[PDB]
Design a protein around this nucleic acid. Structure first.
Lengths: 48, 50, 49, 101
RNA sequence: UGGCGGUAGCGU
DNA sequence: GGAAGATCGAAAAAAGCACGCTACCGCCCGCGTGGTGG
DNA sequence: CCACCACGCGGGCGGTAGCGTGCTTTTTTCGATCTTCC
């Protein structure tokens, strides 16, 4: 849940991103890239 | 005894073994191994005893 | 604070907790060494089904 | 003797890495796709590298070493499966060359 | 007014 | 007399390292791409 | 028409390589003997 990994305001127009948010972003980006490359009929080496 | 244990018997084999130990996962070539050995200790830029 | 999300993985991924925590549950269940499991998991060698 | 390798490049540095590899006298390959783009309202097609951040480099490890390719100021790393870098068969190279999706 | 990392200090 | 169980030491990987409290410092993503004003 | 105020996506960093480097205990694995037989 989001409150378990909150983004505390930094009173400077920015936010403090937690480690969990960074890891989730990495996982989501990797999954989206894999889906896009699978839909593009990528070669076996790139898919692996 | 150390000479007996050591399998290498030539400069090329010794350099290849040293390169494999230093940089595992790379193709061991004579030129790369000799470059690494000569740059590890006898190169001023990388090695410098104060 | 209680509602959770879910991500649909493009391909199945093994659980690291059930893999690296010695003894390897997957390796012990499959009667194969951990090295072979790591090799097949990280796309190093084919395994027959 | 000359063989093909797969290279993962840094973001937005595909052209710089390609030019650096060309300076090393090695063969470079990257798929090109023409896609209709805007760019401030002018209607043409831009070239986008299919399978982004991927390069196919034909060279000889004996002529020039692998780490030299790994440190061409713009190449992120090698696509290695195991200890040694992976080898892409020539059939895949031929497919990629003839394929024009 | 939330967290970490580093440094220094107090009581054992 | 070669193959499978024993074992044996040597090496490699994982985990732990007291309790409270106080003060200060530093940080809380970069870079090719795009629109707007001098 | 050119300088400069936003901006939204990947990943070690940076470099035509190499960086590590003063703990101890427990568990697992592996090469090497070995040894013991069928």
């Amino acid at each position: 849940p989001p409150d378990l990994r909150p983004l505390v305001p930094l009173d400077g127009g920015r936010f403090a991103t937690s480690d969990l948010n960074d890891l989730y972003r990495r996982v989501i980006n990797r999954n989206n890239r894999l889906k896009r490359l699978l839909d593009l009929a990528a070669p076996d080496i790139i898919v692996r | 005894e150390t000479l007996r244990v050591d399998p290498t018997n030539d400069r090329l084999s010794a350099l290849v073994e040293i390169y494999r130990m230093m940089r595992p996962g790379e193709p061991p070539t004579r030129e790369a191994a000799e470059s690494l050995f000569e740059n590890l200790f006898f190169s001023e830029d990388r090695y410098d005893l104060s | 604070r209680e509602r959770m999300g879910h991500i649909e993985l493009a391909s199945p991924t093994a659980h690291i907790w059930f893999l690296k925590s010695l003894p390897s549950r997957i390796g012990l269940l499959l009667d194969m060494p951990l090295r072979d499991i790591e090799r097949v998991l990280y796309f190093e060698s084919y395994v027959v089904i | 003797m000359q063989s093909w390798y797969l290279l993962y490049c840094k973001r937005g540095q595909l052209q710089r890495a390609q030019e650096h590899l060309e300076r090393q006298a090695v063969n470079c390959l990257a798929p090109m796709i023409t896609l209709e783009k805007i760019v401030r309202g002018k209607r043409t097609a831009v070239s986008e590298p299919l399978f982004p951040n991927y390069l196919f480099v034909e060279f000889d490890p004996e002529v020039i070493h692998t780490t030299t390719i790994n440190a061409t100021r713009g190449v992120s790393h090698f696509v290695r499966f195991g200890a040694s870098p992976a080898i892409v068969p020539s059939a895949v190279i031929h497919q990629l060359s003839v394929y024009k999706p």
